[PDB]
Amino acid sequence: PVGAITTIEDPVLAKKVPETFPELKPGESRHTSDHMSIYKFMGRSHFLCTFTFNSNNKEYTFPITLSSTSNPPHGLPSTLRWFFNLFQLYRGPLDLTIIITGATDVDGMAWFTPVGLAVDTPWVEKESALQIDYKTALGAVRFNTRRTGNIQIRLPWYSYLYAVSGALDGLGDKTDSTFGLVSIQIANYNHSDEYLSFSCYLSVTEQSEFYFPRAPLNSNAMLST
Amino acid sequence: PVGAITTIEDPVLAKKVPETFPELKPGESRHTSDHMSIYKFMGRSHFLCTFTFNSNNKEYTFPITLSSTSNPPHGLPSTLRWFFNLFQLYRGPLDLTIIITGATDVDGMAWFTPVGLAVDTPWVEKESALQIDYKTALGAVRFNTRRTGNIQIRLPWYSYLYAVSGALDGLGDKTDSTFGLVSIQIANYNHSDEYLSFSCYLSVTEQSEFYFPRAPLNSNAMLST
Amino acid sequence: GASYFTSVDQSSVHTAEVGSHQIEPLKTSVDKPGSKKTQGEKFFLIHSARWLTTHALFHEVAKLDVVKLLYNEQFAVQGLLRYHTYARFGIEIQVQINPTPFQQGGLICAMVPGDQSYGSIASLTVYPHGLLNCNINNVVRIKVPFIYTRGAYHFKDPQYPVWELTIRVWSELNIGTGTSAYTSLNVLARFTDLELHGLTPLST
Amino acid sequence: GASYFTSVDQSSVHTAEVGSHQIEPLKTSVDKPGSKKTQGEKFFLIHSARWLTTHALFHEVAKLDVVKLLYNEQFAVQGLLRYHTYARFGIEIQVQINPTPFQQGGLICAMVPGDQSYGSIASLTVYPHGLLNCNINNVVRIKVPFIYTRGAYHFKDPQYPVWELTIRVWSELNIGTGTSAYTSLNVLARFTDLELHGLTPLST
Amino acid sequence: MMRNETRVSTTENVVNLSNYEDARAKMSFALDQEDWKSDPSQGGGIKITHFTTWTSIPTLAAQFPFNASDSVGQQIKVIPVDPYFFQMTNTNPDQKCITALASICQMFCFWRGDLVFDFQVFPTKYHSGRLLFCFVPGNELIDVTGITLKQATTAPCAVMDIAGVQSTLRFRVPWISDTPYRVNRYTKEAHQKGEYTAIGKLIVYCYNRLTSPSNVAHHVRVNVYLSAINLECFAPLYHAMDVTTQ
Amino acid sequence: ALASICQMFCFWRGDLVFDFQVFPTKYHSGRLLFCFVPGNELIDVTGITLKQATTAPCAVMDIAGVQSTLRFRVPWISDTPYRVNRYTKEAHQKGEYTAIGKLIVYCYNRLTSPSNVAHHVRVNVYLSAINLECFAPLYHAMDVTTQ
Ligand SMILES: [Cl-]
């Protein structure tokens, strides 16, 4: 037992494989895949946010921000929050999947808006203030509650930055802390009908990368909606 | 630095590769496809027009005209407008995709009518004045709001011209400025129901061609609905 | 024709020159002739504070914007940063102290990119760190490449500090009655693979 | 161990490092990364005056301490001179003007080392010169190596100017009634084979 | 004649996000449905892909003092053996300093492997003493206070001479359990005989009383880092493990 | 042209090319210094002597000549891989920039001439780009930049 004693202050010696007592090889696991492979783990699209429409012909625009500052619901919640703070830099597409709850026969549209461009005021339900032309142009998608009730489309790595991050301060934390924004606009929703709720979940893609490990958020920071 | 000085008036000398200061090779882009390849760009079906039915058993017939003159809604809007004025001649099929909004259980039909043939009065909602026989003959398509809510069919290059154009004057601008016309006729739409709206978007095909570059429309010309 | 600043002349003529570069048979100075590295990629004393018996656990003895700090007339590297707009690079930090063997305790030095955010102080070891223990070592070195959201740091008007070097008390500094109840500390920093871009006359 | 600023440590330890130099797959800037030459051996606008009809023959339109002039915040090279004590080098000067073909006359530009002393103005051609003639050229270039009594020039506190660029009227500038009775002139200078020595925090 | 019939299976338009095979998007916003290459430009080449990255970095779990006043065989500190452990905390800014190892495993239902307790001493070359670290196999809830330093030697343990050129003892607790994996019961309301989170408890006894002159502290502090080797976790879940107030 | 195209994108990068065309007479004479100050589309530059300007990359040009056009190829210099079309946003934000800096036209040598020729000389400024790259489609008819 040589790895039972060392000087941790020395970066080299600290890497000495620890060993105190005599052990045997653990063996083989009974489950196929390794649940600790970030890609496979976050592969399980986790919860992001949720909102509810009140009036007809309105729209909601929620941003995808890593900001550890922005506390939910107006920010990254649960797992997603925790994860995007284990490292400093992130980049790459993200497979978003949104679930629809309640209403029916409600026509809807949604488009991804890159960071640093015109887009309806965040975390707010109001009458859109954008040219239908502009909306569509950024690449959009139409759908109807009746026919489906869920949407799984990928979100592009379209940003003027090399990467984004959550752990930041005021300034940068207001520009380099965002992937982009999503906007869902309903149509034909006579409130005489049931309520309309939306649930958004995010899953990491194979084209997604993670750089430089940070010290995980202290428990007091990990919030949940 | 030789390409830092030249006589632009001379067509030859003006092609001399410009170079002022010492630069290094830009490198490789991080995204797969080149967003500047017209085919891939316009590949993103852009917005064209939209209308709403008021009474039952009626029909709307909107033409596909490049005419820079015809101002929207009764004409080419947003992107589509801008694009079809960057060049002089266009020809080739076009993948149209129309989205239905509102109503339900409404039976509908649509047919493409080539330039220079009988067809219900443009940009107007009225009771069709064509022999069901005639309509169908030109190749039509039936559908129901309930079952679908969107239609993606290709539009043929059926015209007696070699190509069409937007930038033109009165006369020609009234004949050689059109691809063709589309006509949507509803059925079984008791207005006691919700309103019925239609959204039309156009996407360029691989079989589509573009000839001779023009000077883009001055900002004041680029309109939007 | 070469280098920056190009000149286009119509009524041109040839250049007049005399003599050529004369290499000193007997150098008038034995030090490497100034170069990007000579004046830029060298060490400099950034900040320097004290660590006392009073300093409780986890007490932040220093929070420094390493980068921003270097950008200052006080250091020669300034002469290279003062005239370029953007610049990417790596950093090598060296923190040292001098506790008398009769002192005991320890400190932790970590290079955290951007801001410490709400990261668990107890996990600062995840970042490029260096542990100091009175009974052991009195110096530590850390070297890191470029880690930023942008492809370079803007000096004249920065977006957010590239590195925020933090130094907290890893283990309260206690001593026996009579021993010095403190110990000064210094922080050395230097650029590595200094890539400068865009010459500018600006200043702010 | 290398470069300047050496550190002797008794209670030594190893250096901690993470990652390595990452070469941009897609550069964030296409300009040559800052180097001694980039920021030092480039051209800069030193002085600039006028030449009139009033200026009589041999009139000195400009007497400049080329060197001393460069040593000034206004130019990036300063950033290299501001932190070194001594330095030897060569110089390339470029003087240009813009007389309208309806103007006539000429100027002579000479790089005289130290001082013009009592040298015959009529022999200024002996020095590295450049003759300007309205009817001919409007620009001239001169390049010279290091010529001094000492093995280097002291910026912070010079002994005597290395070069004193002089520009005199070689032939009165006359014109026809109506034509502009003047013509601005500019002087460009740059260091060549810039050899810097002795890093210093001084300033004066 | 077109004849391509397919029967509509069960779970029509049902959504599942338990894995990527079903979580992955069915379409894309990206123009021409393009993709993205790799880019370590401003990432220093430090590309992360596994959580091991954290569960192998010794993080500070707890600190305990070794006073001269502590007599021989006196228990100095007791710690359960489960990654979910950590007691470090800072007043203001207010925060419950969780550890790397912890913050990771906290998101799993099960775990297994050899936990590693690294002990760092902060003495002066003038003190002198020994501390015995003993691991008692079992569950996170076993009255251990009734164990003489002697009795403790029966179980696997290790003594350490604080006064020395070295400063850290590495305690690799071998995976010893009646079950293949342990569960993160720290989510459940109460505890149940069998549903355990730890494979036992660790003890810090005072082997040899701390001696020293008089011009040096009357004690010696010790940092306790925690990490794991041969670690394995599975069954994703969410929960921010709170502080184990010993 | 260059504009009308990029106006439909969120990002861009490459070397912009400013072509300067002089409309003088074989009897004028003068020089203009073109200086590119790296930065963002909003940096007070008025406080820069012609001298100070030489620090940044630039080029002087003799107007009076057989040639008539100087081509200024502004190398892509930025802290970011691409710049964004913020001209769509309501206001401006520190970081969200559209340009990599500003270009300046100084008067190197005063314009001289007789008296039977214009008291000035006009200059057309053409704009184009090489090694250009745009991505992220969008719609917006860029308005005029009233300098
Ligand atoms: Cl149904």
Buried b (16+ CB within 10 A) or exposed e, C55-73: bebbbebbebbbbbbbbee
Length in residues, chain E: 246
Q: Is B205 exposed, middle or buried (0-12, 13-18, 19+ CB in 10 A)?
A: middle
C65 is written with which tokens?
A: 């914007």
Residues E124, E111 contacting (CB under 8 angstroms) = no
Torsion of CA C158, C159, C165, C167, to 10 degrees: 110
Q: Where are the domains of chain B?
A: 1-225
Q: Does E148 touch chain C (CB under 8 A)?
A: no
Tell me which method was used to determine the 3D structure. X-ray
Query: Reduced to 3 states, what is the DSSP secondary structure of residue E198?
Result: coil
Length in residues, chain C: 204
> Within a 10 A sphere around the Cβ of A24, how many other Cβ atoms?
7
Torsion of CA F105, F107, F112, F113, to 10 degrees: 10
The β-bridge partners of B5 are F70
**Residue keyed to tokens 């073109």:** F34
For C127, the enclosing helix (H) or strand (E) is none
Query: Reduced to 3 states, what is the DSSP secondary structure of residue C41?
Result: coil
Portion 34-93 of F in contact with C at CB < 8 A: 37-39, 43, 48, 52-67, 70, 77-81
Contact (CB<8Å) D34/C196:
yes
Distance CA A20, CA B153 (A): 72
Distance CA D104, CA D174 (A): 6
**Residue keyed to tokens 């290398």:** D2
Report CA-CA distances (Å) from A48 to A71, A99, A199, A205, C113: 12, 11, 8, 16, 26
Measured between CA atoms, how close is F37 to chain A, in angstroms?
Answer: 21
Residues of F in contact with B26 (CB under 8 A): 13-14, 76, 131, 133
Sign (positive/negative) of CA torsion F91, F95, F100, F102?
A: positive
Query: Reduced to 3 states, what is the DSSP secondary structure of residue E99?
Result: coil
Residues D128, D158 contacting (CB under 8 angstroms) = no
Nearest by Cα to D29 from C43, E41, E159: E41
Contact (CB<8Å) A9/D13:
yes
Distance CA F72, CA F16 (A): 8
Q: Does B102 touch chain A (CB under 8 A)?
A: yes
Distance CA D142, CA A30 (A): 82
- Give the per-residue SS3 of chain D: CCCCCCCCCCCCCCEEECCCCCCCCECCECECCCCHHHHHCCCEEEEEEECCCCCCCCCEEEEECHHHHHCCCCCCCHHHHCCEEEEEEEEEEEEEECCCCCEEEEEEEEEEECCCCCCCHHHHHHCCEEEEECCCCCEEEEEECCCCCCCCEECCCCCCCCEEEEEEEEEEEEECECECCCCEEEEEEEEEEEEEEEECCCCC
Q: What is the C-alpha R_g of chain F? A: 17
Distance CA E126, CA E213 (A): 8
D175 CB-near residues (< 8 Å, 6+ apart)? D53, D102, D103, D104, D181
In CATH, what number does B1-225 get? 2.60.120.20
The β-bridge partners of C16 are D142
Contact (CB<8Å) B104/A105:
yes
Torsion of CA E212, E214, E219, E221, to 10 degrees: -90
Distance CA A97, CA A84 (A): 18
D13 CB-near residues (< 8 Å, 6+ apart)? A9, A10, A11, C136, C137, C139, C140, C141
E9 CB-near residues (< 8 Å, 6+ apart)? none
Q: Does A8 touch chain D (CB under 8 A)?
A: no
**Nearest residue of chain D to residue A161 (CA atoms):** D28
For E235, the enclosing helix (H) or strand (E) is strand E219-236
**Residue keyed to tokens 């000429």:** D106
Distance CA D94, CA D107 (A): 14
Distance CA D96, CA D98 (A): 7
- Provide the CA D48 distance to its chain's centre, in angstroms: 13
Q: How far is the CA of E1 from the centre of ligand 1 (A)?
A: 29
**Residue keyed to tokens 């008021």:** B54
CA geometry: angle at E57 spanning E54 and E60, to 5°? 110
Given this structure, which CATH class describes domain D1-204? Answer: mainly beta
Q: What percent of chain A is helix, strand and coil (3-state, nearest 5)? A: 10, 35, 55
Residues D168, D62 contacting (CB under 8 angstroms) = no
Residues of C in contact with A175 (CB under 8 A): 159
Distance CA C180, CA C105 (A): 13
Measured between CA atoms, how close is F14 to chain D, in angstroms?
Answer: 9
Query: For residue B219, what is the DSSP state?
Result: G
**Residue keyed to tokens 């990359």:** F57
Q: How far is the CA of D79 from the centre of ligand 1 (A)?
A: 76
Q: How far is the CA of A149 from the centre of ligand 1 (A)?
A: 13
Strands ordered across the beta sheet of B94-102: B46-53, B196-204, B94-102, B150-155
CA geometry: angle at E241 spanning E235 and E243, to 5°? 155
Residues B112, B180 contacting (CB under 8 angstroms) = yes
Given this structure, which CATH class describes domain E1-246? Answer: mainly beta
Distance CA F103, CA F53 (A): 11
Torsion of CA E133, E139, E141, E147, to 10 degrees: -40
Q: Is A153 exposed, middle or buried (0-12, 13-18, 19+ CB in 10 A)?
A: buried
- Phi and psi at residue A194, to the nearest 5°: -70, 170
Interface-testing mutation among F6, F18, F73, F127, with chain B (most B C-beta atoms within 10 A): F73
For A147, the enclosing helix (H) or strand (E) is none
Length in residues, chain D: 204
Q: Which value in Å is the resolution of this experimental model?
A: 3.5
- Phi and psi at residue B22, to the nearest 5°: -70, 120
Portion 71-90 of C in contact with F at CB < 8 A: 83, 85-86
Q: What percent of chain C is helix, strand and coil (3-state, nearest 5)? A: 10, 45, 45
Residues of B in contact with A131 (CB under 8 A): 78, 224-225
Q: Where are the domains of chain D?
A: 1-204
Q: Does C161 touch chain E (CB under 8 A)?
A: no
- Phi and psi at residue C91, to the nearest 5°: -135, 145
